[PDB]
């Protein structure tokens, strides 16, 4: 449901950062906010 995909997004945001993709990480950050605020 909602939560599996939330976990994956979180993990890729984290993974993006540790591989030097800070900016991309920040953009996934934004998606988390958007997704959790929602229905």
């Amino acid at each position: 449901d909602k939560l599996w995909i939330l976990q994956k997004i979180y993990e890729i945001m984290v993974r993006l950062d540790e591989e030097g993709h800070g900016e991309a990480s920040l953009m996934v950050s934004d998606l988390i906010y958007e997704f959790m605020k929602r229905d």
Partner: protein
């Protein structure tokens, strides 16, 4: 005697937005020009008053809130806004009458391997009230299972670092923000514009 704005605007480092700093300004004279020219600003919107009008007015107290956010987040520092910063880090009330001032601080706050010292809150159970400051570190519970203060599945730390680097696009570069609030109590106004009385 003279209001210490220089020390707000020109501080070496700034606060994280989730742990935003507030400086009380009292008992002093204020030319609000030393500010207007401090730096090249990317934002300078006053709501109640205007700068030139400010040089005539006296207040009881002025409060200078300051922090660092991303360029693209600056627009959240306004009344009636929503988003990650307005919802969970720093919230202005709708009837706000002071000034929001922002500028690019890429040169000061960005670092080659990224600046992890500036933080924001990503996860919150509800929106902040105007001028609330939540410095909690409760692990957040996303699912139906309680976290019991343990980080894990559907259980996340609530804060993230910005990791500012000089080569990011400008929207993802750090901006220093100063929010001035102008307080008028029933009391002697000790903070006066430089062309008053």
């Amino acid at each position: 005697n003279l209001c210490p704005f220089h020390e707000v605007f020109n501080a070496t480092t700034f606060a994280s937005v989730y742990a935003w700093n507030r400086k009380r300004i009292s008992n002093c004279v204020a030319d609000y020009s030393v500010i207007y020219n401090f730096a090249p600003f990317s934002a300078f919107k006053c709501y109640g008053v205007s700068p030139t009008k400010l040089n005539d007015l006296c207040f009881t107290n002025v409060y200078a809130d300051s922090f660092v956010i991303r360029g693209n987040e600056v627009s959240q520092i306004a009344p009636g806004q929503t988003g990650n910063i307005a919802d969970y880090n720093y919230k202005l009330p709708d009837d706000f009458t002071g000034c929001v001032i922002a500028w690019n601080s890429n040169k000061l706050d960005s670092k080659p391997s990224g600046n992890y010292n500036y933080l924001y809150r990503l996860f919150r159970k509800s929106k902040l009230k105007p001028f609330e400051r939540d410095i909690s570190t409760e692990i957040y519970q996303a699912g139906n299972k309680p976290c019991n203060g343990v980080a894990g599945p559907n259980c996340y730390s609530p804060l993230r670092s910005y990791g500012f680097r000089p080569t990011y696009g400008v929207g993802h570069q750090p901006y220093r923000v100063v929010v001035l609030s102008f307080e008028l109590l029933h009391a002697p106004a000790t903070v006066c514009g430089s062309n008053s009385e």
